[PDB]
Design an enzyme around this catalytic site. Structure first.
Site: not given
Ligand SMILES: NC(=O)c1ccc[n+]([C@@H]2O[C@H](COP(=O)([O-])OP(=O)(O)OC[C@H]3O[C@@H](n4cnc5c(N)ncnc54)[C@H](OP(=O)(O)O)[C@@H]3O)[C@@H](O)[C@H]2O)c1
Length: 307
Positions: A21, A28, A52, A57, A86, A119, A261, A263, A266
């Site tokens: 993502g 932050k 993605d 974005y 998207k 989207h 991040n 790590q 991965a």
């Molecule tokens: N309308 C849509 O189609 C739509 C809407 C929302 C999202 N999306 C897509 O889906 C993606 C994911 O959703 P999201 O951005 O809401 O975030 P998410 O992937 O649900 O959550 C991300 C958060 O989790 C942390 N994190 C990541 N891996 C981790 C792990 N193994 N352990 C603990 N914490 C972890 C990240 O911090 P770090 O970065 O510091 O690791 C960040 O704060 C988006 O980036 C985007 O590509 C699409």
């Protein structure tokens, strides 16, 4: 490091079942946009082959920078990568779809996209004021982008069951994918089942739900130290994040974990040396509250609001 397996789509294209993502909702104050370029690079280095992103974005340029660096350094070739982007809500008229894609492609430094998604089913004017363009019209522009070779596959995002049915009944090619929110507090079981029954695969966005910080208080359980989640992590010698992502995999979904991040990037693809049992998937399903991380309720009165 770890290459995710693929789902074969209804058009024959194969898609890696973990995507990085690149949305910035969790970024932050200390996180500059260049971290997306670095994250894309690190992900590919760690074995990711699916990214993605989205026009909205405003980081397609960074995604393109990361891809270009990975290709130039020999990590991958273009044909080994699956890039998803998207079409934003202000580009829903039929004639806007191809040019919007060409704009995305220019920012990404690519000649084609592997997957282009609508989207949302909502159409707006560029000022976010409501418009009433039928998403069936937008879909015809999507069909055109595919026939031109600019998009290998086409799908949608944030479509509900009624919209999926209408789209399927009134188009000549159904979406390969519906990208929707799936996580323990918003499990979307009926919509996932509906899509899968129609041969439409599901990408699961915001896969970590409220287990990670969303800049809010009063989040629903589970927390990261929740006993159900930590027992699973211990059982399989995996992290809680890996349990949450594997849960989605075991539901047949393509999770989209965002990380910047090295790590955690991965860790988030290392999901293929274990699996959850049916009882464990059921236990996680029991956290459902139909409580969305992504709240678009300001658009509730707009034509084609999906939630
Ligand atoms: N309308 C849509 O189609 C739509 C809407 C929302 C999202 N999306 C897509 O889906 C993606 C994911 O959703 P999201 O951005 O809401 O975030 P998410 O992937 O649900 O959550 C991300 C958060 O989790 C942390 N994190 C990541 N891996 C981790 C792990 N193994 N352990 C603990 N914490 C972890 C990240 O911090 P770090 O970065 O510091 O690791 C960040 O704060 C988006 O980036 C985007 O590509 C699409």
């Amino acid at each position: 490091a770890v290459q995710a397996p693929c789902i074969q789509l209804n058009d024959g294209n194969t898609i890696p079942i973990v995507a990085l993502g690149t949305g910035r909702g969790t970024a932050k104050e200390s996180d500059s946009i260049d971290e997306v370029r670095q994250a894309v690079y690190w992900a590919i280095e760690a074995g990711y082959r699916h990214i993605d992103t989205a026009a909205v974005y405003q980081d397609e340029e960074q995604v393109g920078q990361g891809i270009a660096e990975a290709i130039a350094n020999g990590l991958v070739t273009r044909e080994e990568l699956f890039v998803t982007t998207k079409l934003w809500n202000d580009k829903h008229a039929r004639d806007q779809v191809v040019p919007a894609l060409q704009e995305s492609l220019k920012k990404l430094g690519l000649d084609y996209i592997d997957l282009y998604l609508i989207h949302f089913p909502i159409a707006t004017k560029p000022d976010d004021s409501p418009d009433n363009i039928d998403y069936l019209e937008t879909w015809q522009g999507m069909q055109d982008a595919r026939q031109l070779g600019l998009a290998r596959s086409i799908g949608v995002s944030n479509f509900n069951a009624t919209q999926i049915t209408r789209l399927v009944s009134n188009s000549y090619i159904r979406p390969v994918i519906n990208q929707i929110e799936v996580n323990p507090t918003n499990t979307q079981e009926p919509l996932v089942a509906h899509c899968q029954s129609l041969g439409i695969a599901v990408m699961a966005y915001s896969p970590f739900g409220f287990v990670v910080s969303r800049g809010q208080t009063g989040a629903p359980p589970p927390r990261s130290d929740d006993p159900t989640l930590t027992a699973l992590a211990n059982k399989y010698r995996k992290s809680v994040g890996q349990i949450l992502l594997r849960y989605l995999i075991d539901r047949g979904l393509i999770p989209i974990p965002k990380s910047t991040n090295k790590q955690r990037i991965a860790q988030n693809i290392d999901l293929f040396d274990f699996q959850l049992t049916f009882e464990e998937v059921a236990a996680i399903n029991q956290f459902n509250k139909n409580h969305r991380v992504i709240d678009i309720s300001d658009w509730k009165d707009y034509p084609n609001y999906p939630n």
